[PDB]
Input
Amino acid sequence: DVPSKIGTLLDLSATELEQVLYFSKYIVLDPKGAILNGVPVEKRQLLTDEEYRELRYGKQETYPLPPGVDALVKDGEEVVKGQELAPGVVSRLDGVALYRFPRRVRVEYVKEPKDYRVQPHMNVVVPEGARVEAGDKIVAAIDPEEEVIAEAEGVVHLHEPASILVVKARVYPFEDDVEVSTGDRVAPGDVLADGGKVKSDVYGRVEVDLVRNVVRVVESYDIDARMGAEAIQQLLKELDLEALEKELLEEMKHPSRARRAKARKRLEVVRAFLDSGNRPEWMILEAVPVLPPDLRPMVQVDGGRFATSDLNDLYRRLINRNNRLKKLLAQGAPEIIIRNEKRMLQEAVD
Amino acid sequence: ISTSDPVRQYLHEIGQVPLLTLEEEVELARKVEEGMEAIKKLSEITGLDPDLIREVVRAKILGSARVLDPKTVEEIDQKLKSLPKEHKRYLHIAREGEAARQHLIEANLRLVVSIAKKYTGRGLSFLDLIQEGNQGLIRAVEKFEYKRRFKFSTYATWWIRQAINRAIADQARTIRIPVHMVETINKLSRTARQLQQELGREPTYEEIAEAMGPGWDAKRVEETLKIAQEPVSLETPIGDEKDSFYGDFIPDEHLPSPVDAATQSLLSEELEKALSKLSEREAMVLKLRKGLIDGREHTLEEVGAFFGVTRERIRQIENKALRKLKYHESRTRKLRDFLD
DNA sequence: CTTGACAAAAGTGTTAAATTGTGCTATACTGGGAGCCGTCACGGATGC
DNA sequence: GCATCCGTGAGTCGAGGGAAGCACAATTTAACACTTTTGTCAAG
Output
């Protein structure tokens, strides 16, 4: 209903309100010291999906190498933007480059460049440049008959990567048990492993790699940004109507006429909310009222056929979407599915 | 892409996840299986409920962006991290497995859209079918096994189609019909269509019943067709102007009409006047036995407990007072019209 | 106004039968489809 | 200065209009011998 009352109170345009409500852009509630393109992120800032993903999970990219060719970069080496990874491909961001699926392992026995072939159903269980004693496993497989072991002592070298993963992160070697786990979030100065010998030097998401037995912290911020009507409800709950009224009164003395008109409209809305005793966050529904069924009847006509109103269909759609959203949340569904279901719930309420 | 088109926006959102190669798919499935096994071992060792540990791992993986309160999640996480290296290894495996499960589910939304696009027009919208297929895809990821060397789409299509069909059977009708009955209705419609195209005319119930098989007659087919009748909207327009609707021609036959209330009041008044001629106690006996005071009929023993008299005398006095009322009605005929 | 039976209409347990709800199916399959101008004309309001 | 979005446009009447299976576990219903209470009829 133009002009939007929620947008008037929150100082969001109609386009911004629609984008936030229907899960098109995120809105920030706590930046947690997030820096976007060298510029600190501020509250009430709109983030697109890509910007939110970059700030929340970091930067990474996978380059698929052509079959047969061998990468010029080793596993666990730092690369810069524009550097050539394989003879035919070049990276686009600086970071640690990791072998995704090495197709061949070239172990060097001491008495001997014996090679072993890796297939899609086989996985490497040892890091690159590792000393392997006679008998230790090298490549694991579903069938033990094709499983690769070591004839004698040697050094395991990985070659022929299927693809290179370049991730902007920090790698920390460790020797003892790690104090953190995969998926946790760390800050500078937090302990990682070895009883404080290794500590995080930058924000990010922490993951432990037992194959390479190192701790990788992907550079990302624990930014608080949300979409939909829950973020708008949070903004309206955090609103201080007294302070907003005082600021609007102070801005009402601006020489510009358009500024005074905008201040007057916003202040009229604020005065209405203050005098009425209503709360702004009441404009977002947490419980949807249900009309009495006699006003939305399902009657039987003289012929035995049933006649029902469209409100029953709208209520049924709303209930189906709400129950399915509850089930999806209980199942830990991914963010895309949950976002789609929340958007459908909003559209059904509308 | 389009802010106003939900389907386009969903397709754009799912198009940002690259499709999984065979190696990536196998790695993710293996990681999910290893994570589930690690959760089982962690539950066996720490003695906690496997479901509780899986919920804690999932909450940690999904982060704080999701609304068991967070304090017990943190306590359980600290307890798991208090284990030695040989067990924190299984905790890490569980975390990686949960992350791999999330990645694997996120990468198969194109498959569910492709499956769901063939179920449109059967009572559910496109996006509802997509979300139900997403539920089926989650179940398929839960039950998928990579040891069999089959591709994920082969086993996931079964579950996605199952979920979509179950959702259509459960949510496509205003008056819900059980799944077995929905299957019966669909089979009956298929049989009717086949007979209609083979005979070059609309089949009667006898042919349809014969083609359905044993245990089917024309009566059962007619009852099933009557059951399969969807309710009609009360706001469906009648005429060419569309100003008039169905609900404008359906009388309300629940609330009594003014005539009915008036004749009920008249009958009550005349009955009260008729009971005046009776004795003080006999009128009370009849008004209690017939439920004219408390609203509900009493029994002879209950009226006796009220009056201290046995049941036989109560039935005798009620019969005598009823005979007296019949005599007065015969001598006056002021109560026969209300009998209809 | 009372017992002293007693036919019966009602209420009470289990059980076999329909009836209904739920899980599962392993070659591989991975971004929709109906759109479509006598687009209705015209003030009022917002907002760039 | 223009661009976009939104809400508005007589009344009464009638007339006809009206992907699927399959297996199995729960659950509900029907039915069925039995105990009842609930009416009755018989005289005291």
Residues 22-46 of chain B form the longest helix (25 residues). The CA atoms of residues 1 and 12 of chain B lie 6 Å apart. Chain B is about 65% helix and 0% strand.
